[PDB]
């Protein structure tokens, strides 16, 4: 069976091509830069009101409103500056494990093991939040969802596929296939033409939104990938996984360039994010704390004061002003 | 110091908080259950007798108490991600059929499943209930052969009661961490129509325990 021979030959050839590109590791080149010192961030606003553990949260473009989803069957929109509630949307099911906030602030999204993506309208003339469209094209639990614009959305599911939806007609436009296991991570690029995703098969793949094909494939880890985020420049992205290591990849090189880990951490990684400048990499671990890594020298610059339980999601405002972390305490905390 | 609209926004937030509190109090009395098992095991016969996309959910009430029970059969991937979302369940129901041992081992698979369920990382403090079905047929067909086909060192006489106690201790002995969790057992058949009472006793026990642990500071 020469087909398997061709496959393994191409695998070996890709390895040979990749090993030729490297000439000096990023550690050597960047060793001459001054260290970032110590970065201590103090909790300064605690958002209270959930009754069960929080699964996911997301910011908005205005960097003042956020949306939180909880097991209690509620999707609350907060006002970070004044710790007030603007809406409290009741959900059909209590197994929500994802949420999103449209860039224009007109819609929000919710998903879970109900296998249905619900989009809500916030500026209706009726005066109350009402469901606009419900999408039931998937065959498994939805892990993540992100808005490209008010009429488009990309969702990843456990059926090893990610699909792009035209909200108006409710039909799938393009479908993405190639993953071997459940998909759990997804992040859009600053230029929306591209996006990445993560799976439990220990590989993260790069997609093209409209061409319907994969551009590059990365393996990196040896366990499940649970988080993914784009480096602000749009030419790199970090990944988190169960083996307690974060890894940064470069698109134009199709090769790994840095790994973050220390001998005293063994638990998994739930979320990963960058600062606006891209010099910091905040990762939320399972052991009720989050660490901040100097993204250029791999050193550990500080530790956010821990929650009382696991941190399920972590995000940074578009202006880099604050970092919000959700946990299973039923609380959110803003850091700066 | 606040403006005119800020006060109205604060009032709206307070109203939302009041509604959330009321709904949470309403939802603190709807006990959640989770159904497991290697197969159907005739677990739907309770709902049929009582005649009251995503996953299946059933609702019924009994004695001023609301019951919602879920089914794990809707899983589409490995249970690692499917099971953690049910950490808030009060009790977990597990079913075993007593007439499914000599079918043309399965008992070892059931034992491993029970060990993984009751000793699961996420089910830290969830009481487990055991329902053994098809007792009327099990009593007669034991005469052909005991459970020796899969387990060694069978002890006791041929009386069905002692054998039933042996299997009951066989599943119960998997609770190496009984230091934190309780277990209840009860036999059943397709025509007894009395499971709801045992489920009521179990949920009452779990509710009392949770109230003592959470509010009473015991």
């Amino acid at each position, epitope marked *: 069976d020469q087909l398997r021979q061709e496959a393994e030959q191409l695998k070996n050839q890709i390895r040979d091509a990749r090993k030729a590109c490297a000439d000096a590791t990023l550690s050597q080149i960047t060793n001459n830069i001054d260290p970032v010192g110590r970065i201590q961030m103090r909790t300064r606003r605690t958002l209270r009101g959930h009754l069960a553990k929080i699964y996911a949260m997301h910011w908005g473009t205005d960097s*003042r*409103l956020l949306v939180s989803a909880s097991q209690d069957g509620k999707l609350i929109i907060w*006002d970070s500056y*004044t710790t*007030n509630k*603007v*809406h409290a949307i009741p959900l059909r099911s209590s197994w929500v494990m994802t949420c999103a906030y449209a860039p224009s*602030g007109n819609y929000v999204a919710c998903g879970g093991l109900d296998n249905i993506c619900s989009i809500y309208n916030l*500026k209706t*003339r*009726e*005066g*109350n939040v009402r469901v606009s469209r419900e999408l039931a094209g998937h065959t498994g639990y939805l892990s993540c969802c992100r808005f490209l614009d008010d009429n488009q959305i990309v969702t990843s599911s456990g059926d090893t596929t990610c699909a792009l939806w035209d909200i108006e007609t409710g039909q799938q436009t393009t479908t993405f296939t190639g993953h071997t296991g459940d998909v759990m991570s997804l992040s859009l690029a600053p230029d929306t033409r591209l996006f990445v995703s993560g799976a439990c098969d220990a590989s993260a793949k790069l997609w093209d939104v409209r061409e319907g094909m994969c551009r590059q494939t990365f393996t990196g880890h040896e366990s499940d990938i649970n988080a993914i985020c784009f480096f602000p420049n749009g030419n790199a992205f970090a990944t988190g996984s169960d083996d307690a290591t974060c890894r940064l990849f470069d698109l134009r090189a199709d090769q790994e360039l840095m790994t973050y880990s220390h001998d005293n951490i063994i638990c998994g990684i739930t979320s990963v994010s960058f600062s606006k400048s891209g010099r910091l990499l905040l990762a939320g671990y399972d052991d009720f704390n989050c660490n901040v890594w100097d993204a250029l020298k791999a050193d550990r610059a500080g530790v956010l004061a821990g929650h009382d339980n696991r941190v399920s999601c972590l995000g940074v405002t578009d202006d880099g002003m604050a970092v919000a972390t959700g946990s299973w305490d039923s609380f959110l905390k803003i850091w700066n | *110091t606040l*403006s*005119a*609209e*800020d*006060k*109205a*926004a604060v*009032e*709206r937030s307070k*109203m939302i908080d009041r509604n959330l509190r009321e709904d949470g109090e309403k939802a603190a009395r709807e006990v959640k259950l989770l159904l497991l098992g290697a197969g159907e095991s005739g677990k739907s016969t309770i709902v049929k007798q009582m005649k009251i996309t995503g996953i299946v959910e059933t609702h019924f009430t009994f004695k001023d108490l609301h019951f919602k029970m879920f089914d794990v059969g809707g899983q589409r991937s490995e249970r690692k991600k499917w099971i953690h979302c049910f950490e808030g369940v009060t009790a977990i129901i597990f079913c075993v059929a007593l007439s499914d041992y000599d079918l043309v081992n399965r008992m070892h698979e059931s034992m491993k499943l029970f060990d993984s369920i009751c000793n699961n990382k996420w089910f830290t403090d969830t009481s487990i209930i055991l329902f053994l079905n098809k007792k009327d047929l099990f009593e007669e067909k034991i005469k052909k052969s005991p459970l020796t086909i899969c387990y060694p060192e069978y002890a006791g006489s041929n009386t069905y009661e002692e054998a039933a106690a042996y299997i009951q201790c066989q599943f119960e002995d998997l609770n190496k961490r009984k230091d934190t969790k309780e277990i209840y057992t009860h036999f059943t058949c397709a025509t007894d129509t009395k499971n709801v009472q045992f489920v009521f006793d179990a949920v009452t026990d779990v509710i009392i325990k949770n109230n003592l642990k959470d509010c009473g500071l015991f």
Partner: single-chain antibody
Amino acid sequence: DVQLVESGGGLVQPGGSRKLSCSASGFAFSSFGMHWVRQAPEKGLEWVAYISSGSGTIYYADTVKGRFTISRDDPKNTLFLQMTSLRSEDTAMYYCVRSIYYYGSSPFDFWGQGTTLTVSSSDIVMTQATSSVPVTPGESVSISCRSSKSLLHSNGNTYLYWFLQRPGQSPQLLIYRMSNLASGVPDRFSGSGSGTAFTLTISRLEAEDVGVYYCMQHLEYPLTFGAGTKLEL
């Protein structure tokens, strides 16, 4: 569609009592706090009373307190204004306005058809001069509104509003907080100004938007309205 009708007008002898109600439909009534507004036969508008969601806060005008009372019945979606010991000057047409307050909202977004009531017979002051402004279709014009006390609150918002009352119609919202176009308003209009001087510019006039333009302040109760300026064709 969204409708909001009211009834209870007629002829009332001086010193008597009368009752009028505001029936609302097509929107969540309980989530909106609603106002009452009055208009003299020829003069401008004035603010009467306010009731919030949950009826936890109520306000009145300094010329209304002790006479009127405001209550709401959420289950059947009907407001009420019971007036006692009426006066000759109390004659006016009463509108039934609605407003909701949350970050990014549009208070005073709908006005009722209105009812007519006839009698047998310190605080911010808004100045709006040039009561008459001639204009022709296709020409660009502007109107200036002024406030005695600065409306630039410490939180970065200037609480100013603009309204337009076409002949034989209820007022409609044009600009809220001095820089935001209300839903459904043409992009022709615009608003800008400092903390004490304000202006509204119409880029290109049309015969469909002729009327009286008012400016209202929402920094601290009671609310105040300008004298209104007419545009004549």
